[PDB]
Amino acid sequence: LTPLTEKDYEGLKRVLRSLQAHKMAWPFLEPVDPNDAPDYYGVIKEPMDLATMEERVQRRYYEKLTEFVADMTKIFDNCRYYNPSDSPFYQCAEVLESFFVQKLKGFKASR
Numbered sequence: 176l177t178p179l180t181e182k183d184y185e186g187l188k189r190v191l192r193s194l195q196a197h198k199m200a201w202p203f204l205e206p207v208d209p210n211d212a213p214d215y216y217g218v219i220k221e222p223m224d225l226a227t228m229e230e231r232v233q234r235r236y237y238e239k240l241t242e243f244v245a246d247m248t249k250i251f252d253n254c255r256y257y258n259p260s261d262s263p264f265y266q267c268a269e270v271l272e273s274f275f276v277q278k279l280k281g282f283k284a285s286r
């Protein structure tokens with residue numbers, strides 16, 4: 176639609192910080208450690224995590240909201256692809272994605 180403004184970036188920071196404070200965000204705060212899953216980086220071609228997104232927000236990496244949403248969606252898509260549906264990581268991804276949608280709707284409403 177329209178490119179992100181400085182005021183949009185304040186809203187992105189608020190959304191990201193809300194995700195980072197969520198109780199079920201613990202699997203996604205930092206990159207997957209190869210010890211957590213030895214074949215992870217051979218299976219997942221574009222890893223993503225919230226610390227990486229935080230660095231990108233601080234550097235003003237994102238020009239459009241769709242790019243920020245795409246990175247967030249990678250976090251959850253990676254998790255559901257690698258893990259079976261009974262895994263605690265998978266369950267966390269389901270909870271946090273629905274929370275992100277709720278926060279995303281609020282962000283778009285405030286624009």
Ligand SMILES: CN1CCC[C@@H](Nc2cnn(C)c(=O)c2Cl)C1
Pocket residue numbers: 201202203205206207208211212215253254257258264
């Ligand atoms: C660093 N941090 C430590 C706790 C959990 C881990 N997150 C994982 C680990 N393994 N797998 C398979 C995953 O999908 C995720 Cl999100 C990342």
